[PDB]
Amino acid sequence: XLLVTAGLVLA
């Protein structure tokens, strides 16, 4: 999807 992560980018 549309996330703002730091290491495990998810859907």
Add this chain to the structure above:
Amino acid sequence: KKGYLRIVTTQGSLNIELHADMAPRACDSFLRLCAVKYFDDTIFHRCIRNFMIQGGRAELRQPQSPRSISGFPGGAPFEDEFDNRLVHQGIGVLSMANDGKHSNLSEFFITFKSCEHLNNKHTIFGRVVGGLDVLRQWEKLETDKKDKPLKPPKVEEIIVFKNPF
């Protein structure tokens, strides 16, 4: 009480207002990191058209600290700060990247457009008040399979014009 700063990159400059009034800890951390030139040579390493561009990762600095830390003594993560008047609406929202609750260090993003599913998940701590057209050019950058631009904009320096702490 607001903070004011310019991020100067190899592909344009951004004028930024920090909401030190509504997100004091995130603004303070950021400015403490600006003080020791932490962001110099870091890149914008993740860029998704119609969403955001992401930066601030110490580990990806193309050169002082090799791992990501907050601006506070010890470098520990700090808690989230939300406010109903601060939403991920429109272009140029400055917000914190994380890996869940209260895991704020140094990584941040600037929105290309609304992404309000991020409200109350990410500390919004500023907005771009000048350079929206630099942002619009960044949005067009070609990126690899992992969404890293082929030519990532790299921070040359950050000029702080006002730190209220």
